[PDB]
Design a protein around this ligand. Structure first.
Ligand SMILES: [Zn+2]
Length: 258
């Protein structure tokens, strides 16, 4: 039936409807820190989110997305390994049922409690829908979350979850600044990959930040209270919405640091 994260429609089944699942540039991957090549030709990232306009938060049945106005160059990413301007369209997270798992990517096989994905699309393609069909159409910034101290900037997000508990619910979500979710350092790893959920298109330039941000136990707790199901359907907690690491195959992970 339709894809999800349960036993019967989980990652191991995806290839039946999305054959690209077994492609050559699938994500996520394990980042082997001793095999990643420091590349001094990589430029520093440029994050300009000062004009970011958030509009809405939505439960789509697999995660929650905070959506932004991408009608103009208001929140963009450039620099790093990228050519051109990438506009922020949305961010969402991947998390676990326990603090020992939840991230998509792993570092030296270590799993994090969650992973934030900031999704950007290449302005040269005019819209998101055309961008996903190109090898360089998307840029996704991945940020690891570990449990420790609370992240003040994530709290406006935690507090609205109650209102979008089930699939298809949405709430107005204006004036949220995504700068409150960045770590202090912008050192990163980069490799060519894909979306980590169906349709798994291989159109992503991944930018994974070396430094994790911390959230409190109580904050991740609230994530685990969401539902995969729609209102009036049997309750399935939204947990473990991450895909296991995929073979690197013929790809190199480059590091912006040493
Ligand atoms: Zn994601």
């Amino acid at each position: 039936h339709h894809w999800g994260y349960g036993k019967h429609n989980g990652p191991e089944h995806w290839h039946k409807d999305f054959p690209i699942a077994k492609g050559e540039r699938q994500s996520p991957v394990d980042i082997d820190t001793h095999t990643a090549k420091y590349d001094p030709s990589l430029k520093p990232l440029s994050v300009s989110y000062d004009q970011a306009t958030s509009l809405r938060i939505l439960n789509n049945g697999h995660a929650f997305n905070v959506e932004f106005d991408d009608s103009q160059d208001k929140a963009v990413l450039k620099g790093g390994p990228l050519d051109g301007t990438y506009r922020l369209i949305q961010f969402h997270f991947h998390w676990g049922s326990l603090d020992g798992q939840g991230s998509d990517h792993t570092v030296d096989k270590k799993k994090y409690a969650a992973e934030l994905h900031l999704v950007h699309w290449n302005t040269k393609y005019g819209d998101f829908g055309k961008a996903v069909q190109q090898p360089d159409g998307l840029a996704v910034l991945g940020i690891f979350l570990k449990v420790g101290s609370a992240k003040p900037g994530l709290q406006k997000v935690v507090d609205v979850l109650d209102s979008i508990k089930t699939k298809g619910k949405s709430a107005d979500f204006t004036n949220f600044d995504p700068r409150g979710l960045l770590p202090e350092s912008l050192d990163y790893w980069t490799y060519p990959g894909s979306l980590t959920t169906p349709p798994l298109l291989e159109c992503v330039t991944w930018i994974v930040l070396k430094e994790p941000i911390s959230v409190s136990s109580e904050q991740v707790l609230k994530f685990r209270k969401l539902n995969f199901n729609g209102e009036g359907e049997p309750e399935e907690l939204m947990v473990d919405n991450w895909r296991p690491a995929q073979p690197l195959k013929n790809r190199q992970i480059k590091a912006s640091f040493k």
